[PDB]
Amino acid sequence: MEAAHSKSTEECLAYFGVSETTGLTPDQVKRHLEKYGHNELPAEEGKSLWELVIEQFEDLLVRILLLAACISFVLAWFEEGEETITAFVEPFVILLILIANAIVGVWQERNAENAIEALKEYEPEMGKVYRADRKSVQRIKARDIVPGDIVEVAVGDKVPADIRILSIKSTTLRVDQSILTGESVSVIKHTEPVPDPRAVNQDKKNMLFSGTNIAAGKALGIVATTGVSTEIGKIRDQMAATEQDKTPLQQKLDEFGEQLSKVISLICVAVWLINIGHFNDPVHGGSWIRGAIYYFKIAVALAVAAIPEGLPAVITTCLALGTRRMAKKNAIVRSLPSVETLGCTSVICSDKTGTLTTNQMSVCKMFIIDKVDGDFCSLNEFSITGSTYAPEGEVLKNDKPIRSGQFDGLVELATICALCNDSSLDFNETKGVYEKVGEATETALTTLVEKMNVFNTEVRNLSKVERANACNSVIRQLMKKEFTLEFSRDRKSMSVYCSPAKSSRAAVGNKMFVKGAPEGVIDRCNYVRVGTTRVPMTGPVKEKILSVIKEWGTGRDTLRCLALATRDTPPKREEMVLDDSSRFMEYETDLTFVGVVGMLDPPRKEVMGSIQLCRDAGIRVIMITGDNKGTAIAICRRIGIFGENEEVADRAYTGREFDDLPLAEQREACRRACCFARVEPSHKSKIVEYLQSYDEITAMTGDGVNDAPALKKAEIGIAMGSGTAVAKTASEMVLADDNFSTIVAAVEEGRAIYNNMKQFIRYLISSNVGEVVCIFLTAALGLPEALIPVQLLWVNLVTDGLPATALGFNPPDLDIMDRPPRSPKEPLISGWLFFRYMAIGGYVGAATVGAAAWWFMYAEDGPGVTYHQLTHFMQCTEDHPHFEGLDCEIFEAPEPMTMALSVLVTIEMCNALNSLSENQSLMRMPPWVNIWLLGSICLSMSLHFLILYVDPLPMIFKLKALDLTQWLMVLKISLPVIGLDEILKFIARNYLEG
Ligand SMILES: Nc1ncnc2c1ncn2[C@@H]1O[C@H](COP(=O)(O)OP(=O)(O)CP(=O)(O)O)[C@H]2OC3(O[C@H]21)C([N+](=O)[O-])=CC(=[N+]([O-])O)C=C3[N+](=O)[O-]
Ligand SMILES: [K+]
Ligand SMILES: [Mg+2]
Ligand SMILES: [Mg+2]
Ligand SMILES: [Mg+2]
């Protein structure tokens, strides 16, 4: 039954056909279960199935490397008639890397969700119904509640379904709806229909919503909606329809691959076309394969040589360590490339209740009467530190710690807060936090008493369980609560009747403690207490009170105020009737004013500073709450979204205000406004969608069910640890300790990750360029091969593979978060940076062939051949006239190849130092800054000196120990690459941009 809110109670009972007193007949229950089903959502699919491994292979970089692994495998398997390993090793080790690259991927999010599921422990939901089976109320399974079921709820009960209220057994019924509507205060329910057409759940005050909590009172209702049809279920399907693209980092790596897939196709056809004349016609050789496609085969192999091969591992490595860093900061991350997405965020959309605030009422201000000199009235005002239900906090007077006990007025103020209270404080030892029992407004008073400690009770050696109501149990030993006068709307206050206990100080008679709305309570006061003494209510005194209450009610410190009073001479209890609550206001007269407490749903202490750090980084914060506008504006002014006296007007919109604007004017209002209040869960995603329409990477921070669709819509969703389950599943990042200052740390991380990522990409791609140039120059000049694929394989994975990993530990700049977020359209690799590594890449290729050629001609240790003999080494034969005094085996010597390899590994160690910064000289920013890099240089160089002197390795890498003087030549070739990059860096500093 949809829209049950807009229909009368008797109209709802007719829809299912069930008496209010009897209940559902088992015949009806059986029919109502086949026409509506079980009250539950589809099974939780937070299980990482083994089909989600293909998601790790959606990255085309891995796919390119996978494709390059397959086209490097086939040409060596069916050709050349050689089953050696040299051509076979690279095919499977690439495949061995990729399968291992996918391991960490499906293990990270698996380890993540196992920590997210740990956040909420199993507490099976139940429900209380009335049926024709038994007259007594029977507690049944929550899932077995059908629409049309007569359901009663009491204080503390979690509403099992979307229920239309029928009758409120108590005077008033308060319902906490923070997790669904973001409403900071509990709502009072009625039974009358709401004929509002465009009504939000917040306007539907005649129904109970599933998932919400009952604050106070009890009522009996009719279930109008169950299962996925409920307001929670509607959102579950709402986010199920919500679709998001790949993470900004993941899609930025993809476009780099599309650029690398082009040069892979470019050099594949370039080598194929330059050898024209030989191709496009069958020549002497290769008749088994028509067309002589031999030139195509060597072109494909050369294209594969351009792939950094080791790169898809060094990237995942960098993200992996950056993830556990956040884990140290109690931040759980779903996907690996989601650790960067917060580093390129332009707008952070945050929810209010539960996210920006603790969602726990806290008494922060509090005053009593100090002196009454007829015309002069002074007050004793106090401040209370805290922001949670925890008994942790001290009472201050004029920002100085005081003992509440030495104030007689405060002792009585506590006595009222402890006795006139139907709520308690409990310590959830499972979650390790303090939770409320009943109404938040009263629990705040309970917390206040525990913090005050008016009798100075030692509580040091008490467990957190019995600490929750320690100071309150001391007060409750003094007076005996005879009965309580429940809250009523016409009066807006409540009171309790108390008689002394244990005959202690029986000189005084019974008392009556009252609390309620200030103006209403004070109007019924005739006396004000000054410590222990009482004086009449004078005009000036009356004014001094109301002036402060009005001040605390608005402005700088907008609070929820509450006046506290006692009735020194209460009526005899036999002359009081507790049947009609309209008599209660009269009983609460001739009162004595004691004091007033100020409370609010306070912002988290880390929120204000975090917002400023985001602003300094150029990240605009925007509040999106379902709470009323007044509270929203007030919170914004405290955290720094708005100024103390800043004129908001159309920088803040409500649900209706925003829904009345045309679509064109709606998206333009999302770049101006920074506060949207009284907002449906639908609008939250729409605001995110609008910000994304201007190509802005926007984040979302929430905790409630109404935040779920927006948490999923954003590029990155951030869920609070003390939030709903659906919010946790809809997000990628989960703050485990609700620390808001973790976000700004995840921004610095994401900016440090991306910057370092550009570095070891440029570092690895430059090496492969040199290799391609080397292989090409060899085939161009007809020289002996300088580098064999087995050597380059070892290099790109080990020797310059892990120094690239050490580049992921480059120190963050000081100007890392004083600059705006990077541009979305801005590419990972630019045309300038392309030329930059292509220039040093070209040098590497020319240096490698030059090193080997040096050994053949001008090296004293070498044969000293001429250039013609070197370029015609294949025409060499025994006793060849043009090769006099030379063995043709000298062109297969391992010594010149060692030169080409030692010049390659050394030129990368120098390039590693240049890869420290992008535009900073080594003279300005010294190379001894990164100690992680230097360690990688030594280890890789250690292996290089290990790969020459060990003896078995030179026999498989075709190498030999280098000469003591020949090493000096290597340094005279490798070192200039520093000066090359230093030149490129020089015309970058204030010459490329200045
Ligand atoms: N309009 C109203 N309708 C119903 N109750 C009201 C009320 N206005 C105040 N109260 C009751 O007045 C107090 C101050 O209002 P506050 O928080 O400053 O709001 P204001 O700005 O002054 C008025 P606004 O809505 O036009 O903006 C409130 O405390 C309790 O009920 C409230 C309460 N509770 O959970 O909220 C619980 C409770 N018990 O016992 O559980 C008792 C209250 N009480 O007053 O006794
Ligand atoms: K997300
Ligand atoms: Mg290779
Ligand atoms: Mg919230
Ligand atoms: Mg108000």
User: Residue ranges of the domains in the chain?
Assistant: 11-54+113-240, 55-112+241-345+746-994, 346-358+603-745, 359-602
Residue linked to tokens 């690459």 = 977
**C-beta of 346 in contact with ligand 1 (< 6 A):** no
Cα separation, 371 vs 953, whole angstroms: 94
CA-nearest residue, atom 14 of ligand 1: 517
Obtained via which technique? Answer: X-ray
Other beta carbons within 10 angstroms of residue 857's beta carbon come to 14
Cα separation, 616 vs 814, whole angstroms: 13
- C-alpha atoms less than 13 angstroms from C-alpha of 988 in its C-beta half-sphere: 15
Q: Are 886 and 866 in contact (CB under 8 A)?
A: no
Catalytically annotated residue among 351, 601, 707, 738: 351
- Ligand 4 centroid – CA 246 distance (Å): 26
Residue from 487, 550, 564 to probe ligand 1 pocket by mutation (most atoms less than 8 Å from CB) = 487
Residue linked to tokens 């590693």 = 912
Q: H/E/C letters for each residue in 741-793?
A: HHHHHHHHHHHHHHHHHHHHHHHHHHHHHHHHHHHHHHHHHCCCCCCCHHHHH
What is the dihedral sign for C-alpha 202, 204, 208, 214? Answer: positive
CATH of domain 346-358+603-745: 3.40.50.1000
| b/e map 3-12, b = 16+ CB within 10 Å | ebbebebeeb
- Say what the alpha-carbon torsion angle 792, 793, 796, 801 is, to the nearest 10 degrees: -140
Cα separation, 694 vs 715, whole angstroms: 14
Residue 339: is it exposed, middle or buried by C-beta count within 10 angstroms (0-12/13-18/19+)? buried
- Ligand 5 centroid – CA 391 distance (Å): 27
- Ligand 3 centroid – CA 65 distance (Å): 9
CA-nearest residue, atom 44 of ligand 1: 516
CATH of domain 359-602: 3.40.1110.10
426 catalytic? Reply is: no
Cα separation, 386 vs 113, whole angstroms: 32
Q: Is 522 left (phi over 0), alpha (psi -120 to 50) or beta?
A: alpha
**C-beta of 116 in contact with ligand 1 (< 6 A):** no
Other beta carbons within 10 angstroms of residue 545's beta carbon come to 24
Cα separation, 796 vs 765, whole angstroms: 10
Q: Are 428 and 435 in contact (CB under 8 A)?
A: yes
Q: Which CATH number fits domain 11-54+113-240: 2.70.150.10, 3.40.50.720, 3.40.50.1970, 3.40.50.2300?
A: 2.70.150.10
Residue 335: which of 316, 349, 354 has the closest Cα? 316
Q: Would you say domain 55-112+241-345+746-994 falls under CATH 1.20.1110.10?
A: yes
Q: Are 787 and 848 in contact (CB under 8 A)?
A: yes
- Ligand 3 centroid – CA 86 distance (Å): 11
Ligand nearest to the CA of 697: 2
Cα separation, 945 vs 908, whole angstroms: 15
**Pairing relation of β-strands 675-677 and 620-624?**
parallel
**C-beta of 785 in contact with ligand 1 (< 6 A):** no
Q: Is 226 left (phi over 0), alpha (psi -120 to 50) or beta?
A: beta
Q: Hey, what amino acid is at 308?
A: P
CA-nearest residue, atom 25 of ligand 1: 560
Q: Is 187 left (phi over 0), alpha (psi -120 to 50) or beta?
A: beta
> Which residues in the chain are followed by a discontinuity, with C-to-N distance exceeding 2.5 angstroms?
none
Fold equal for 11-54+113-240 and 359-602: no
Alpha carbon distances (Å) from 178 to 181, 330, 377, 723? 6, 24, 40, 10
The kind and range of the H/E element at 937 are helix 931-949
CA-nearest residue, atom 12 of ligand 1: 517
DSSP three-state, residue 167: strand
**C-beta of 186 in contact with ligand 1 (< 6 A):** yes
